[PDB]
C-alpha cells in the first residue's frame, strides 16, 4: 500500500498505456514473442474428412516494455494478475488448422511478470484440417503438419520462436501416436513483398489400427471360405443333394456381398487406401468365380448331373437293354475322378489361401526390417 | 514525437466512426475485393450446400489516414483494428447459407498515404446450383453471388482480382472430385436502383474413381448368376425346384440393391442416369427371369392260355410306358436350347447396350468443360 | 457543408431514441407490415418447420422528422441506421419458431420530411399447420398469423397492404407444389379484456405434394409381385410337384411386402400424410396377404394327395388290378377340373379388388388432376 | 403536461435493483400463471419436454403511482423491461433448458403499481413418464416453477386454476391427450431438509395417449402370424410326407419375420418412453407361439421310419409279393396319422387359448379403463 | 434513513472489482466447497457423458467485509448480487466439456461480518472415466477431479467438506445402481516445476450397471437357436430322410445370428463395452457353426449311403438276388447306431458348453453379487 493504489493509478494501464498503440519501444524491429504448444487432449479423429478436434495449452510469451515495475509493483510482487482488457491480445491463428475458431483461448486471465514480460497460456478446443489424403491409411499413417502464430503482424511487427504429444494423449484413440517434433520459423510469401511473422510448425507423425476390426473381420473370411471349401467336400460325401448344394451357393453368396457392404460404409467414414481393399476384393472374387465354376462342374453331367420262352426273352431283352441306360447314368458318375476333384480344389485352396497370408507375410517381414 | 500527439489528435478530431469514406454523392470509394481460397471442406452434393474457406482481402484508400513524420516516415506501415469504417457485410444472394467466421472486424494493414489491406481467412456457409446436375460427366454450372446486405452500390464501387483467379488455384487434392474452372463476372441488377451482387461460375468436374469399379461387378457378376440360371435349365432340368431358389435369391438381391442406392443418393443424389438404365437392366433381369419362368411353366402334363397271362404282362408294361413316353414328347428340351439361345440374344444384346451407353458416356459427354 | 456540423450536433441533442412517436391520444403509432418471401430454403414435413427468405417492409411515420436546409438541406432523404427508432416486436403468432434473421441494427431511409421505411433482408424459422391433411394431393392451407407482439390497437397497430399468392416466389427446389395463397387483415379484440388489441396479417398456404419419382418405385413391385402371384396360381394347378417350391415364394414375397412397409412408416414418421391414405396400402397390400395364405393353404388342401397255372397269373394279375383302382384314387385326388376354378375364382376377384384399388387411385386422381 | 419534468423528477430518485420495500423483512406480493401454447417435444423414454409457456407475470411496485402528468394522462404504460426488478423464472422440477426469449419483453405499468407481463417461452423440461405413463390411467406430470432467484422471505407468488387445461394449446401432433390439469400455490421445505422457503408453482398434467395407428401394425403381423402358424397346424393333416421340408421352410421364414418385428418395435420404446405391460404380451405371446411351433415338428419327427421247377420259382416269387407287401405294409400301420389329425385340434384349441388369453386380456385392459 | 444513502454510496466509492481480496503472501483464499447433487437428467453410456446438477456450495472470507452499525446494523446478513465478487474459475480437469449453467449474475450471501456462501444450482455436461472396463460385473469408479484451473497453490485454496454418499441422489430409474462414492481433497504441486499448483476435489463414482430387460431377450434367441441346432442333430436320427432339410436350418440359423451380430455392432458402438464380454457369445455361437461343421460333415460321412423254362424264371429271380445283397450294402452304411452316439456325443457337449455359457455368466455374477 506503499503508494500502491496510487501507483497502479500512476501507470493507468488503459490510460497511460496506449491500447491503440503497440508498445514496440517505438520504431525498431518488434516486441519479441514466443509461443509454446502443449496438447491437453485429442477428442475426435476423422479420417474421411481430414479433420481433428483437439485441446491445446496456448503457452504465450512477449515483453510489455511499459510493464517494467518499480517498488510497490515489481518488488511488492515480482508476479501479479491482469485481465484481457488491461491487455493487448494478439490473434494467434492456427494458420492452416484454424478452420475451426479457437475457443476459451481468447482473452482469459493472463500472468504479469514483474517487469513487463507477460505470460498468457490457457486452453484451446480446436478443429483442424490435417494432411490426411487417401494415403494417411497405408501403415505409415504419415505426418500431420500444423503451424501456429500471430497472423496479422510482419517480421517488423512480429517475431515468434518456440514438448510432446503423449502429455495428454486420448487413450480412447483407435490410433497410436509415434512421434511429435517441434521447430519454429519465419516466412516470406508469393503475394507479400516483405518477410514477416514467425510461427510454431509442429509435425505429428502417427499410426492407427484397431485391434478389434481384425477380430470380426478375419473371422468371416475363414468362415466364408470354409463354405466354398465345404461346398466341394460335400459333392463327394454325397453330391446328389443337388438342390441343397445349390442352396448353399445362394446362401454363401448373399452373405459375402453384404459383408463387403459394411466395408465401404465405415469406408466413407474415412477414405480407404489401395493396399488393403485389393487383397479383399480381388480374392473374394477369386471365390465367387469358383462358386460359378462350382456350379457347372458340380451339375454338368447329362445323367450323373415254345412261346413261353419268346415272352420271357422279351423281358431279359428289356432287362439288359435298359441296363445300358441305367448305366448311361453311372457313366456320368465319374468315381475314379473323385480324389482328383477334391485334390484339384485342395491345390487351389492352398494356392490362394496361401497367396493372401503369403502377401501378409511378405509385407510382415519388411517392416520388421 | 515529431508532431505525433498532433497527427494522432487531428485524425481523431476529423474522423467520423459512423460515416462513409466519401465526400457526398459521386463515385464513393473504389474498394478492391479478392479472395485467396484456403481449401474447401464439404460439398453437400445432395442439397447444394458449400462450406469453404478463403481470405477476404479488402483494400481501398483512406485519404483521411495519410500520416506525417513519425507514423508515416516513422513507420510507413502500421497495424490497426477495424471497427472504424464501412466493412463488407456481404451475403451471397444464392448462398450466404449462414454467418461469417474470421471474415470481419479483424485488424488490418494500413499504408502510409492510406492504402488499406485487410487479410482474413474465413469459413463460410454457402450453397450454390450445383443442382441435381453435378453428376453427368458433362457436369455443370453455377452462380456464386457475393455482396453486402443493405448497401446498394451508390456510395462505392466493387472490383475483383483475376478472371482466369481460377478455381483450381486451391482445388482440394483430397477430392475424389475435380476442377474445370471458376470465372468471375461483376453485375448490377437493373431491376433495382441498387448495384448489387457478383456472379462466380462453377464449371465443376466430379470423377472419384474408386467404387463404380465394384459397381461394374454387380452388373457383370449379376449376369453371371443370370447366364447361369438360364444355363442351369437345359443343364439339369430337375433344376425344377432349385430354379426358383435361384431367383428368390436373384430377385431379393437386386431389390436390396434398390435398398442401398436410395440411401447413398441420400447425401448425394442427381441425375438418375446411371440408375435410370441399370434400373432398366434391373427390370430386365426381373422380367426376363420371370418369363423364362413362364418358359418353364410350359409343359401341360409335366408342368396257350399260358400266353394269355404273358399278354396281360406284355400289355401292362408297354401300355403305360409310351403314355409316360408321351410326357417325354411333352417336355423334350427343344426350347431350352432355342430359348437359352434366345437367352443368348436377349442377354448378350442387352448387355452390349448399357456397355455402349457406358462406352458413350465416358467418351461423348466429356469434352464440353469449356 | 450546408450547416454541416451545426446540422449533426443540434440533432443528437434534441432527439430521444427511446421515445415512441406519440402525438396526442389518437392514431397510436400507425405502422404497416408487408412481407415479400424472396425464396425458401428448406422445409420439414415431419416437424412442420420452414426456413425462408423475407424482406420485411415496415412503414411508419414520425412527424418529428420533417426538416429544413440544415437536415434536408445537407442531403435530401438519407440513410439513418435503426437504433434511434421504435421497433415493433413482430411475431408470427402460431409460427414464430424463433427470432428474425439478421434483423437487428440495419438501416433505413428518412426523408427531408420524415417518412420512414425499414425493409430488411430477413430469413427465419417458421412453424406451420401441416396436419394429417397436408400430404394430400389436395393439400391443406397453412394458417399463419402475423402482428405486433404485446401491443394492442390503442397503444399501437400493425396493418395490411396486401394480397399476393404464395407461389409468387415459392421455392423452386420444393418437390412439391402450390395452389394459391391469400392474406387478409383483421383486428383481434379479446373476450378477456373490454379493450381494443392489436391487428394481424393472416397467411393461408394452400399447396399439394409429391414429386413423382417415389410413386413409381413402390407401385411397380406391386405389379411385379402381381405376376409372381399370377404364377403362384398358375404354377400349382398346372403341376403341384413343386408345392414346397412355391413355399419358397410365399416366404420370400410377403417379406418383401413387409420391407415396403418399413420404408413408408418411417417416412410416415418423417412426414405426416393424412392417415386415411394409408388404408389404401392397407387392404391392398393385405389382400396380397389374405390371397397367399388361402391360395397356398388351399393349394395344400387335399387328404390324399395335395388250369391252375392260369390262376397264378390271375392272383398276380388280380394284384395289378386292385392297385389299378388305388392308383386312380390318388390321382382322383389332385384333379385338374377345379384348380382352373380357383384360377378364374380369384383372378376376377383380382380384377374386382384390382378395379376397387383403381377406385381410390382414380378417385383422388379425379381431384388432383384438377 | 409537465411531461418532461415529471419523468425527470423520479428518474432522479429511480432505483433499479431495489424492490419497493417498506423494509427488507416482509417481501412483496407477486402474481403469476401459465397458459400452455406449445408442447414441442415429448421425449418420454428420456422424460423431458419443450413448451411455449405464457408466463403471466404480475406484481405491485408503488414506487410509481402517478399524479397529474402520468397516472391521469394515461392509466396505462409501456416502460422498458430492463427498467427495474424482474423475476427469473424456472421449473424447479422441470427447467432443463434456459429460457427462450421469455425475458427482456416490455413490461406493463398501471398508475398505482399494477404491473402485468405475459411473455412466451420455449424451453426444456422433465416430467414423469418412465415406464408407466403408457397405460390408460395417466401419470400426472408435476411441474413446479418459481423464481430461480430469491427465497419467499422477501418474495411471495400467487396462483391459479388448479381445477379447470391442457388442451388450450395442446399439440395436435399428439398421439396423446390430457384429461386434467391441477395448479396450486405452495411454500419450499421438502423430504431433503431445505429451509429458507422459496415459494413455487405446481403444474399437474394427467394425460392420455394411445390414439393407435401402430396398433394394427402390431395387430396385423401377429394375426397374420397366428393364421401363418394355423397353416403350419392344419396344412399338415392334408399334407403328404414331403412336407417335413415343407413345414420347415415355413418355420424359417416365420421367425425371420418374428424377430424382425421384435427388433423393430423394441427400438421404438427406447427412443420414446417406456411401459412394460404391453411390451410383455407381445414378446412372450410371440415366444410361446414359437415354442409350440417347433415343438410341433418334434411331434412329426418322432417315429422310427415313418418320420414242379415251375412251382419252386412260383414259390419264391409269390413270397416277394407277400414279403415286400408286409414290409411296405409296415410303413402303413406306422404312419396312420392318429397323432397328426388330433395334433391339429391339439394346437387348435391351444391356439385359441393363446389368441384368447391375449386378445381377451387386451379386451379387458381396454374395457376397465374404457 | 439510517445513514441510508451515505452507507450505500460509501460501499461503492471504496469498492473495486479489478482487485481480488487477497490477503498477504498467504494461505491462499480460504475456499470452501462441496456437494449438492440432486438430479442426473442425462448420461450416456456410449460416450460417458454426464449432464447433471450440483449446487457447488462455495464458502470463503475477505476481511475487508468486516462492518459496524452502518452495514451490520442495518440488516445483519444481507444478500449481495454476485457481480461485485472475484469468482474462482472452477473446472472438471479431464472434463469441462460444458459451460457451467446458471452461475453468472446471481445471489450472494453476505453477513454483517463476513460469512459468505452461494449455492448455485449448476447444471453441466461432464466427461470422466469409465472406459472399456466400466460396465463389467466387477465395476469401475469414474474419477472426477475438480478445482481452480491455472492457479497453483501459492495463491489460491479450496478443500472438500464432507461425507455424503453417492446413492444420496442416484437415479432410481437407473438400468443400474451405485455402491459407494468417496471424495477426498489434495494439493497438487508437480515434479516439473518447484511451485505449489492448484488444489482439487477428486470424486470417484463406484457403481455397477445394466438393467435386465436386454438380458432376457439376448438369451432367449440364444436358447431357441440352440434348440434348432439341437434339432440339427436329432433330425438325422428321427428323420434323416430330410438331410437336405437339416442343411436348410443351418443356412437358416447361421444367417439369423450373423444378423444378430449386425445389431450388436450398431448398439455396442452406440453404447461401448470391454471386448472381453463378446468373447463369450463368440465361441458359444461359433459353436453352433463349428458344430454343424462337424455334425453334417459327419452326417454325410458315408461314401455310398451319405429244365430250361425254369432257367429264366431263375434268370429273373437271379436279377433280384444279385441286387438284393448289393442294396444291403448301402443300408449297411447308414446303421443308425453311430447317429445315436453323435447326438449323445454332442448332447453332453451341448449340455456342457451350454452350462459353460451359464457358467461364466453365473461365475461373473458370483463376482458381481460380491
UniProtKB/Swiss-Prot annotation, chains C, E:
Residues 1-210 are extracellular. Disulfide bonds join 128-142, 192-193. This is Acetylcholine receptor subunit alpha. It comes from the Eukaryota. Pentamer of two alpha chains, and one each of the beta, delta, and gamma chains. One of its GO terms (cellular component) is postsynaptic membrane. It comes from Torpedo marmorata. It catalyses: K(+)(in) = K(+)(out); Na(+)(in) = Na(+)(out). InterPro entries: Neur_chan_lig-bd (IPR006202), Neur_chan_lig-bd_sf (IPR036734), Neur_channel (IPR006201), Neuro-gated_channel_TM_sf (IPR036719), Neuro_actylchol_rec (IPR038050), Neurotrans-gated_channel_TM (IPR006029), Neurotransmitter_ion_chnl_CS (IPR018000), Nicotinic_acetylcholine_rcpt (IPR002394). GO terms for molecular function: acetylcholine-gated monoatomic cation-selective channel activity; transmembrane signaling receptor activity. It is found in: Postsynaptic cell membrane; Cell membrane.
